[PDB]
Amino acid sequence: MVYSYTEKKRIRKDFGKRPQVLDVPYLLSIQLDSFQKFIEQDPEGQYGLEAAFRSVFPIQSYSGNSELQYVSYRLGEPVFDVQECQIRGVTYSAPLRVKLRLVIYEREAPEGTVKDIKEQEVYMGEIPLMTDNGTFVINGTERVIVSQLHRSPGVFFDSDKGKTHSSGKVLYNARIIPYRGSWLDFEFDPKDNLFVRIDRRRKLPATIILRALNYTTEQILDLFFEKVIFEIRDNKLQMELVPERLRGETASFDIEANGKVYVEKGRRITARHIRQLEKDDVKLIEVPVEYIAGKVVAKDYIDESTGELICAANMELSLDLLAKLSQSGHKRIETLFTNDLDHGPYISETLRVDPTNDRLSALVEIYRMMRPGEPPTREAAESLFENLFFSEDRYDLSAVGRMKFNRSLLREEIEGSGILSKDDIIDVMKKLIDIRNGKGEVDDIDHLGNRRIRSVGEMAENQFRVGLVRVERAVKERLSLGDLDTLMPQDMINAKPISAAVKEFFGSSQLSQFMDQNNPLSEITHKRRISALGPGGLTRERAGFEVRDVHPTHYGRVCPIETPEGPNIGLINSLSVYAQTNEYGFLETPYRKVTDGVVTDEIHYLSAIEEGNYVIAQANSNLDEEGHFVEDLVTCRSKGESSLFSRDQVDYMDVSTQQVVSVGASLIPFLEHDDANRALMGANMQRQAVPTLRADKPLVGTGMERAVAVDSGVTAVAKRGGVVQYVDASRIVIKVNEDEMYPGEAGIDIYNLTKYTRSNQNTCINQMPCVSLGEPVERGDVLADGPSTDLGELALGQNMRVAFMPWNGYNFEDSILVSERVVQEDRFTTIHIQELACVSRDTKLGPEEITADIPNVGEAALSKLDESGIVYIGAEVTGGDILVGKVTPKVKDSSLRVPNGVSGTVIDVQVFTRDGVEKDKRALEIEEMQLKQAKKDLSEELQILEAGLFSRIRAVLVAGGVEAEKLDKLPRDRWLELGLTDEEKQNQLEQLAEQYDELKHEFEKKLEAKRRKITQGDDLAPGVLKIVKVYLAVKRRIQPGDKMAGRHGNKGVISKINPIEDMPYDENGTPVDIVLNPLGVPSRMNIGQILETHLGMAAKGIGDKINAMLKQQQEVAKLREFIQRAYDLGADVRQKVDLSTFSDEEVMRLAENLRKGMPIATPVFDGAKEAEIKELLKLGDLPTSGQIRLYDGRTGEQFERPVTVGYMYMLKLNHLVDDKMHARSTGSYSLVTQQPLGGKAQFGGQRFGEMEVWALEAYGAAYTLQEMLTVKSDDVNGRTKMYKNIVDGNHQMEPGMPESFNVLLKEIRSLGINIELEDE
Amino acid sequence: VPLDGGRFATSDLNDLYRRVINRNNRLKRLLDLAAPDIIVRNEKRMLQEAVDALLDNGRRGRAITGSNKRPLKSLADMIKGKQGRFRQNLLGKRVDYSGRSVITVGPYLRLHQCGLPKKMALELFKPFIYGKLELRGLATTIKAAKKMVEREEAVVWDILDEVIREHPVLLNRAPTLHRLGIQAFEPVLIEGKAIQLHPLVCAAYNADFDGDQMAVHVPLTLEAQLEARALMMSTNNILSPANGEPIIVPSQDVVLGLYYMTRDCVNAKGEGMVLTGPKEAERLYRSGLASLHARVKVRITEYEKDANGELVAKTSLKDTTVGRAILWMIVPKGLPYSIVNQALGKKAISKMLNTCYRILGLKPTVIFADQIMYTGFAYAARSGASVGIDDMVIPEKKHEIISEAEAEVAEIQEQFQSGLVTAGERYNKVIDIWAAANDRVSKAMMDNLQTETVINRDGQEEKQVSFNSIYMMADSGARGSAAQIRQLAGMRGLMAKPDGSIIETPITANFREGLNVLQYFISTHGARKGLADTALKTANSGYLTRRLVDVAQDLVVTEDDCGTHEGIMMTPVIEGGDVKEPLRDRVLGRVTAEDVLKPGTADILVPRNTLLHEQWCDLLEENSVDAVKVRSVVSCDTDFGVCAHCYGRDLAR
DNA sequence: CTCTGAATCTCTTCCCGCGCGCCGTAGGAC
DNA sequence: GTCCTATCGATCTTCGGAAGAGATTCAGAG
Ligand SMILES: [Mg+2]
Ligand SMILES: [Zn+2]
């Protein structure tokens, strides 16, 4: 057994029992391997930019009769890396270069070119790149593309009751949904006439398509219907009985011959009669003329002699018609079999709607129904009809759509073309008619086998296609008209349409979300959201219980708990922990192979429609350490049904008890106990915790923290193994070991940590070291904590000591009462960093300046600016302080002032300048910083190679060919001028001094390039001269009104900040830190929070025994004994750990991190039994009831009965109150109508909205209302007369008439509608 | 308007008029230059099709756009509907002198107060503050007083605490379904930043305290203060508008405390002695000499208001408990002690409070309600009424009840395994076997909770009502009655599929114990349905209330008595057998339509237009009356309104 | 031969507050 | 690079709203 060097510092005591056979996949492979799938070229041309190019090129005009064609593409390295790009505020992007070859043919000749011109990689655009954290950077702002989930291409059959006609019956419908191009709907009319339409246009008679494909009705009838024949021999019109065509229906008429009668008139027909029908060989039989007089004919019948019609396919027969046509010599008359149950006549019925004659008349009807007002025309019509279904420019089932289609038509194969074909539509019709004949089933729409995930690497491939589609339309014309003589490919194309397409996508699409960089969980659970909304999806306002609800295939694929309750429940889901995207995009999830009777430890991923074909055991099911099930019969799910089945009947097993959830819920301990309301609100509140100041560890967790904090990319992780060379909380630098070094390198990995910086939500993000100088580290160890982490565990909140009890009502209803001790400790203080910016311009009156020489202001304000016109770093500032002394010509003091209300310390400034514009000493101050920071880190390589190279001189001197009359005092390349002879050592000296010079020249260009990065200005917007951004850090504390939450979806405002003496304290005199209310636990059934408290209490107790054993100077062998006795506690828990191997050093180093509570894991559905919590509390010296008697610090009286006390984990949420408290006396008003502005970002007035006005009207209160909506609001006179009457204290109003109502009058009178006020 | 740098905001109409005027410039040209019919029919079409845009863009074949297919908002799009003047700016509009904050509970408030932050009061009341600094002559005028407020000088608070000293401020949450959703309170100043609201009133707002923001408005004029104090002040609104039922209905912790205070425990310290009054009952409690729920006898006095309305005071021994003696001290002097002599719970105390309003009236009732609140909080504190997992009680018969029912389900299965029962019958009987198990588990668990308390009566054990923590909360009506505790420790029971059809194998577990993965996953088909319903419903409910006020708003009570003799007839609603509502629900407080006779003949009982107030409806309940004819607003023959008598009792008064 | 039944099309409605976040005419000709 | 003029007058606006009601279109016949 082994633990990595960052595990072996706080080995979380694990209570899990099921052995985790599959370790959690890298939590963002959803995203990264999607974008990698876009960005890689791939000669198997599907997927990626290359697939899109090969979707358009080769490209040509017929009249140009020449082409240009895509050869290959290259993607250059990005002009600025992520860190610098995120400073400079551009987007992190890469230049796209494409080998286009233009080919010039000739007339008359064979096509052999007159010339062709490979343009040496024409520039095509700048595609953004994904950062390894899975995020794009789009205008310095960091953005995330959520995966979409939408209806896969294919064919889908559907039906409903009551939603249509409601006379008990149901109507059936088929759709073909291509990936790109037109939708085709087939549907029956109630009277089972069949109809078709494109793109939800008008309804058409369905055979209009078969007509359009030029089947005659005779052929259609041979495609759809079974034949029944009459042979006019042995007697007039004998009949071809196929026996099985009579079963269950009544023999209402005479059928007999030759010996035993099968079934006489009026009786059902059955098997024994059919067998007698077979044994008599009923190949022809006598039937009454009423039977033939029922028929509809199959085939066309002219009279050959007159040459003229008597009957036609699907025309209906009668005795006299039969007589004349058989009399005309047509001795075989042929018709259809149409039993109403099994063979309904729907296509013949459709031929009774049909207005068409044949192909052309249908194409006429198509073109007139689709493009009303354009002329139909034989040469023109096909340029509609073919581009509906048969042409690549406008119809495309991708490979997934073809697969799904073929699977539903039960085809043998799935390598198929993306267009339809005649037989491809006909098969849909046949399958739809089988459904109406009752012999088939409709698909469940909302099934994760019918909806597939699209992620970034596919949405961007489509938007890039829209680009190439608009270049198609330009380049075809330019090629067709062009001379082909001077044009080269970089004339043929230009980037602007591609760049528009892809930049608008990544910038502004409904799915290019601005990342919730709130804390490391919220980064991740956002990068793996599954969204039903957006382009090609549904809409949040326009769906109902059919899709919001969970479905049985969600299990293991989508988390049922973690969805953002509100107007879009379940239109957003979170992709479950273990789930994965299949090749095609369907969600698939891993299961264990059950081989005969033993659970084999191999995992097969199952998609949602493989799963229904097996029976799959629930993850809890026990096994015998050989791996046979222990239970003789076991719970499994099967076909959405679940029940018990035999041992060795079951065929797959779940991989882990965590498989059903997302990371967002998988982090709740004891989730096994909570109402799924309160699980949901928990798993939504964890992603809102703001990173507190001094974050640590949850004492009770699930062991998922060790993964969320690492995979979220925000802790800095050791890229290669080695030893810590230096640390200073800004840099960490690692001497990588030679077993993982690359041979020419210096061999030294710096990590410049990010310090105090705004998150996208204004919380700070300073990384801090966890290493010590000279400490060893191994690849993948956490070197530095992120925000909200410590030692690499996720740590949103603080393990506050809580007791559950009423307290004089301060924790009524939900509220949290808090002791002053928590605020004094800086437990929940949090740092909020704002960014304020002053732009400056080349305006129409002339160019602005930044200066201290501001007009109309004296040193009373300017004392905080430097001499340049920017605030000093470390200035502490408040409302109205001038941060940046901008001025405008013709001079106007427009300067950046700190907005009202806010306050903070100015932690940093940045300065950006156009080209050809002068700097200033705060630009030179920033240059001095950044230059020096680049140069230092470069020197720490050049120094290391210089030292190595002079050793490489010294050693091969000192070992042999010594010249050491004096040695180390000398400049170690002046060592060359010593008198060594022209034996090889002097030539080694000369060569290695040339290697030393070239080592200098190497950095002599590397530092020049770096300084050139810093020396330059930046790509400002048009009009601006320069911009400066100034950052205010605020250390906000905690106060009444702030919100805190547990993990269990318990939440409250904190209501009072009680002084320590008022907190309850125990029989040992320690006060409780928080007092939660009890009644929420039964009333909202989230009792898992109690077991977290008790297990938390035990967690404190073990640290309590350890801390005592470190204050007392216990020897390690006794201390190790107690720690070991803690890890081995419980049943056959999964984990094993041997402090015997920890070398004493690391036992003390471990104890020094347990000494405030042993951290515990309670994996989600696999937790501690109660009997193991008691066992831990008994190992501490604690009361196993979990409860303690408490006393009230207001009197020292005892409380009656003990109360729960223990260490809950509590999160401060980002809804803290000073960010919401607001009030307005008077200020701005809007221009169009004079009502007040609305906001906090503007000094706004609260909306006395519509419902409040009914509320006043429902008291008698008329004067209040009159005021509220005029004098206080709108009447431009009355409010200034009111204000003066109030300062005069007159308490009287003059109410007038609101100017918004006069706006209405003019806006009506701006129609030709004379509205007017009237007098009497 | 210009925006960020030298760019005009795309100001839609000016793009529409621009279309028109361009087209008109061309059409004047091509008319005077005398173009042929086909050309002028072109421009004339394009002009008509442009003025079409300017009036009501998008009633055309397609709305015209100037961006990524954003339709430009035309005039008629400015008038109508949810973003247009009538709803957006006329009917309700933003207002000055307002602010908002997170509310938080303030237990010490008297019912009429709320605390609001000094920062807000100072930024809200500014006009009134200047109206004192000039009146002190301490500031020269606005120009100085503005600065003197900005500097936040030491005087200003003593001025503020004179400005505000009794100026009602209006607090309302949003949405605000009903009149009780805006109320006025006298403010009291606070150091923090939250609005301290009164505990009992949070229920009216449906203000939970979990971070639920609330807006405040100052009324400016004298008339707005007189309306606020007379009508909207919380003391004037103890009743619902909708039904004769209090809205001050006690907060869960208050009723928990009063339940705990008034129980009897058959063994206690100081049990069985005899006392001369509540005051020495309290000395006995507070010194720790008697336990609060100990049995005792006390001398009591109580008061009754006679047939005239004047007090008769009476005195007796009473047999009771220490805590019922202490609680009697809070009741105003006119109620009978028989209302307190019982272990109180949420229904029992609501009627307590209601009877106070019945007998004394409003002004004592609001103070009595305040005292109840303070009392309940204080004894609920001493009670230490915690919750703890050792207090979840599982009846061990549960194990047998499953192990029995499982085989009987398998009997239905074995018949099915022999074809001996139909595919419908197998299912619809199995789910009834699970129901028969579930009722038994629930019944055994409620018996076990009551069973957990038994104690020595100085010799031999005897049982009493269980002090088990979760059972106090159920049996008191604080929170979480039968349907919750059943799930916490009984069984979770049957669950339903998405299409409502029932699961063949229930959740026989409960949240004290673990759900396995499947039981949990099926559990979410419940809860996610219930959340989808909430988020989906909250639209249609609002569109319903809109349609209603916007049809009802034309009515006002406008005559005293329209003079009808017509009306409609009220009976208990008798259906499905028994009566689902009695007559005293329907008829109370309407006026009689016609003379109401004695059951029988010729004896009249109520004159023909008398309000049937409570003493009349109790009288009808003394009689064998079944049907009563009353006036109803549908029959009131007032034109353009309703007469008062036809409407009858005002429920809030 | 069009008169009362019914049939397909479009128009209109969809909680209240609130807070963030960003993003904001183009193409061609002189 | 700036200023002025115009929009697919050589396509393709999205299927995944329901409803609910009206205006407007057609049956079986007296
Ligand atoms: Mg709330
Ligand atoms: Zn009336």
By Cβ distance, the residue of A1165, A1167, A1258 closest to B517 is A1165
**CA atoms in the 13 A half-sphere facing the CB of B394:** 15
Tokens of B103: 């509310």
Q: Where are the beta strands (DSSP E) in A1182-1277?
A: 1187-1188, 1190-1191, 1203-1207, 1211-1212, 1222-1224, 1247-1248
Q: Which of A827, A905, A848, A854 is nearest to A1073 (CA)?
A: A827
In A909-1055, which residue ranges form alpha helices assigned H by DSSP? 921-958, 984-1015
Give the C-alpha separation, B194 to B104, whole Å: 6
Residue A21 lies in a domain: no
Q: Which nucleotide is nearest to A91 (CA to C1')?
A: C22
3-class secondary structure, B565: coil
Q: Copy the structure tokens of residue B47.
A: 């002009």
Ligand 2 centroid – CA B602 distance (Å):
27
A686 plus A810 within the same structural domain: yes
Choose among A923, A912, A898: nearest CA to A1034.
Answer: A898
Contact state of A1043 with B384 under an 8 Å Cβ cutoff = no
Task: Provide the token pair at A415.
Answer: 């390598």
Residues A1055 and A1108 in one domain: yes
CA atoms within 13 A of residue B509's CA, in its CB half-sphere: 16
Residue B531, amino acid: L
- Does A1001 contact strand C, using a CB cutoff of 7 Å? no
Distance (Å, whole) CA A1006 – CA A1000: 10
Q: What dihedral angle (degrees, nearest 10) is formed by the CA atoms of B12, B18, B21, B25?
A: -170
Instruction: Identify whether the C-beta of residue A1020 lies closer than 8 Å to the C-beta of residue A916.
Output: no
The conformation of residue A978, written as its DSSP 8-state character, comes to S
| Rounded distance between C-alpha atoms, residue A1124 and residue B603, angstroms | 94
Spell out where chain A is interrupted, by the residue before each break (C to N > 2.5 A). Answer: 890
Residue A1228, in any domain of the structure: no
Nearest CA in chain B to A500: B68
- Does B209 sit within 8 Å of A815, measured CB to CB? yes
In this structure, are residues A172 and A157 in contact, taking their beta carbons and an 8 Å threshold?
yes
Same domain, A33 and A143: yes
Q: Is A824 left (phi over 0), alpha (psi -120 to 50) or beta?
A: alpha
Q: How far is the CA of B208 from the centre of ligand 1 (A)?
A: 4
- Chain A residues 145-174 with Cβ under 7 Å of strand D are 150-151, 163
Smallest CA–CA distance, residue A559 to chain B, in Å, is: 9
**Which residues of A are less than 8 Å from B170 in CB distance?**
1264
Instruction: Check whether residue A538 has its CB closer than 7 Å to nucleic acid strand D.
Output: yes
On whether residue A1225 sits in a domain, the answer given is: no
At CA B504, angle to CA B503 and CA B508, rounded to 5?
A: 85
Which of strand C's nucleotides are less than 7 A from any protein C-beta? 8-9, 11-25, 27
Looking at the DSSP assignment, which residues form a beta bridge with residue A1248?
A: B93
Which DSSP state fits A796? -
Backbone φ and ψ of A886, nearest 5°: -65, 150
Residues facing A1204 on adjacent strands: A1187
Dihedral in degrees, nearest 10, Cα atoms A537, A543, A544, A545: 0
Taking CA atoms, B276 is separated from B265, B273, B283, B317, B327, in Å, by 22, 10, 12, 9, 15
Is residue A9 in some structural domain?
no
CA distance A758 to A754: 11
H or E element at residue A833? strand A830-843
**Maximum distance among all Cα pairs of chain B, rounded to whole angstroms:** 122
Among A93, A98, A337, A346, residue whose Cα is nearest residue A230: A337
Alpha-carbon span A653 to A589, nearest angstrom: 12
Strand partners of residue A835: A1031
Domain boundary among A343, A371, A397: A343
Closest ligand to the CA of B214? 1
The CA dihedral of B542, B546, B547, B549, to the nearest 10 degrees, is: 130
CB A1294 within 8 A of CB A1278: yes
A579 contacts A557 by C-beta, under 8 angstroms:
yes
Locate tokens 């073309």: which residue?
A417
Task: Check residue A961 and give left, alpha or beta (phi > 0: left; psi -120 to 50: alpha).
Answer: left
Q: Where are the beta strands (DSSP E) in B415-556?
A: 454-456, 461-463
The single-letter DSSP state of residue B634 is G
Half-sphere exposure of B594 (CA within 13 A, CB side): 11
C-alpha Rg value of chain B to the nearest Å: 35
Q: Are A1251 and B175 in contact (CB under 8 A)?
A: yes
DSSP designation for A4: -
Q: Any residues with CB less than 8 A from the CB of A1260 and at least 6 apart, and which? A: B227, B231
Domain B389-537: top CATH class: mainly alpha
- Interatomic CA distance for residues A1163 and A906, integer angstroms: 44
Using the mean position of ligand 2's atoms as its centre, give its distance from the Cα of residue A1253 in Å. 28
Query: What's the burial of A1049, exposed, middle or buried (CB within 10 Å: 0-12/13-18/19+)?
Result: buried
A721 and A601 inside one domain: no
**The tokens of A585 are what?**
């995009």
Tell which residue, A632, A502, A465, A419, has the closest CA to residue A93: A502
A1265 and A1198 assigned to the same domain: no
Residues 251-270 of B with CB under 8 A from A: 251-254, 256-257
Q: Is residue A757 within 8 Å of A764, Cβ to Cβ?
A: yes
Tokens matching residue A869: 């016109």
DSSP state of A609: H
A946 and A871 share a domain?
A: no
A666 and A623, same structural domain?
Answer: no
Closest ligand to residue B102's CA:
1
User: Do A69 and A84 contact (CB within 8 A), yes or no?
Assistant: no
Same domain? A349 vs A433 = yes
Cα dihedral A1160, A1161, A1164, A1168 sign? negative
Residues 6+ apart with CB under 8 A from A881: A861, A864, A871, A875, A897, A898
Residues A47, A143, single domain; the answer is yes
Which tokens in the block code for residue A931? 């230059």
Instruction: Supply φ then ψ for residue A442, to 5 degrees.
Output: -85, 150
Among candidate residues A575, A608, A623, the one where a domain is terminated = A575
Residue A1187 vs residues A805, A1047, B256: alpha-carbon distances, Å: 11, 21, 20
Give the CA A420 to C1' C8 distance in Å.
31
Task: Judge whether A1230 lies within some domain.
Answer: no
Crossing angle (nearest 10°) for helices A346-353 and A217-224? 150
First-to-last C-alpha distance (Å) of chain B: 53
Helix (H, G, I), strand (E, B) or coil at A879: coil
| CB contact at 8 A, A310 and A291 | no
Q: Going by C-beta distance under 8 Å and a sequence separation of 6 or more, which residues neighbour residue A800?
A: A822, A827, A1073, A1074, A1207, A1208, A1209, A1210
Whether the CB-CB separation of B136 and B159 falls below 8 Å is answered with yes
Tell me the DSSP string of A1093-1149.
HHHHHHHHHHHHHHHHHHHTT--HHHHHHHHHHHHT-SSS-S----GGGSTTHHHHH
What is the β-pairing status of strands A816-819 and A1051-1058? parallel
- Ligand 1 center–CA A1210 separation, angstroms: 18
In angstroms, the separation between the Cα of residue A180 and the nearest Cα of chain B is: 20
CA angle B642, B646, B647 (to 5 degrees): 75
Dist. CA A602–CA A587, nearest whole Å: 19
Q: How far is CA B384 from the centre of its chain?
A: 28
CA A607 vs CA A572, A602, A680: distances in Å: 20, 16, 26
What DSSP string runs through A148-200? EEEEPSEEEEEEESSSS--SS--EEEEEEE-SEE--EEEEE-TTS-EEEEETT
CB nearest to A1264's CB, from B135, B210, B227: B227
Instruction: Give the whole-angstrom CA distance, residue A212 versus residue A422.
Output: 10
Is residue B199 less than 8 Å (CB to CB) from chain A?
A: yes
Are A810 and B105 an interchain contact pair (Cβ–Cβ within 8 Å)?
A: yes
Is residue A143 helix, strand or coil? strand
Amino acid at A1031: Y
CA distances from A756 to A318, A456, A692, A829, A1212 (A): 94, 31, 13, 15, 20
The per-residue DSSP string of A96-121 comes to EEEEEEEEE--SSS-S--SEEEE-S-
State how many domains chain A has: 9
Binding residues of B for Mg(2+), as ranges, are: 208, 210, 212
Lookup result for tokens 């009732």: B365
What is the three-class DSSP state of A396? strand
Q: Are residues A1085 and A679 in contact, defined by beta-carbon separation less than 8 angstroms? A: no
Numbered residues of the known binding site of B: 208, 210, 212, 562, 636, 643, 646
Close Cβ partners of B193 (under 8 Å, ≥ 6 residues apart)? A1039, A1040, A1041, A1217, A1218, A1221, B101, B102, B117, B119
Residues A183 and A234 in one domain: no
A371 touches strand D (CB under 7 A): yes
- Residue B648 Rama label (left phi>0; alpha psi -120 to 50; beta): left
| Nearest DNA or RNA nucleotide to B3 (CA to C1') | C24
User: Measured over all CA atoms, what is the biggest interatomic distance in chain A, rounded to whole angstroms?
Assistant: 136
> With 0-12 CB in 10 A as exposed, 13-18 as middle and 19+ as buried, what is B369?
buried
Boundary-marking domain end, from A412, A444, A476: A444
> Distances in Å between the alpha carbon of A1040 and those of A811, B105, B194, B209?
12, 10, 6, 12
**Interface test with chain B among A675, A1199, A1233, A1240, by most B beta carbons within 10 Å:** A675
Q: How many CA atoms lie within 13 A of A1273 on its CB side?
A: 28
Query: Considering CB atoms only, which of B95, B385, B390 is closest to A1245?
Result: B95
Q: How close B335 comes to chain A (CA, Å)?
A: 27
Smallest CA-to-CA distance from B591 within B510, B531, B650, B527 is with: B650
User: Of A1082, A1273, A1286, which has the smallest distance from its Cβ to B127's Cβ?
Assistant: A1286
In a domain, A15, yes or no: no
What are the chain A neighbours of B134 within 8 Å (beta carbons)?
A: 1287
In a domain, A535, yes or no: yes
Question: What contacts B136, CB < 8 A, 6 or more positions away?
Answer: B159
Find the radius of gyration of the CA atoms of chain A: 41
Residue type, position B543, single letter: Y
CB–CB of A100/A117 below 8 Å? no
Please list, in sequence order, all residues whose beta carbon lies within 8 angstroms of the beta carbon of residue B454, skipping any fewer than 6 positions away. Answer: B461, B462, B463, B464
**Rounded to 5 degrees, what angle do the CA atoms A380, A384, A385 make?**
110
What domain range includes position A685? 657-713+789-828+1037-1220
What is the Cα–Cα distance from B504 to B494, expressed in whole angstroms? Answer: 8
CA A416 – CA A1222 distance, rounded (Å): 63
Type of residue found at B373: M
C-alpha to C-alpha distance for A529 and A507, rounded to whole angstroms? 18
Write the CA distances from A543 to A161, A325, A531, B477, integer angstroms: 18, 59, 14, 39
Method: cryo-EM
Residues A243 and A273 in one domain: yes
Q: Is the peptide bond before A1236 cis (omega within 30 degrees of 0)?
A: no
A473 CB contact with strand D at below 7 Å: yes
- If asked whether residues A998 and A1023 sit together in one domain, one would say no
Q: Angle at the Cα of B393 (from B391 to B397), degrees rounded to 5?
A: 165
C-alpha distance from A705 to closest chain B C-alpha (Å): 21
Decide if A182 is inside a domain.
yes
Helices (H), B517-582: 517-552
CB A31 within 8 A of CB A575: no
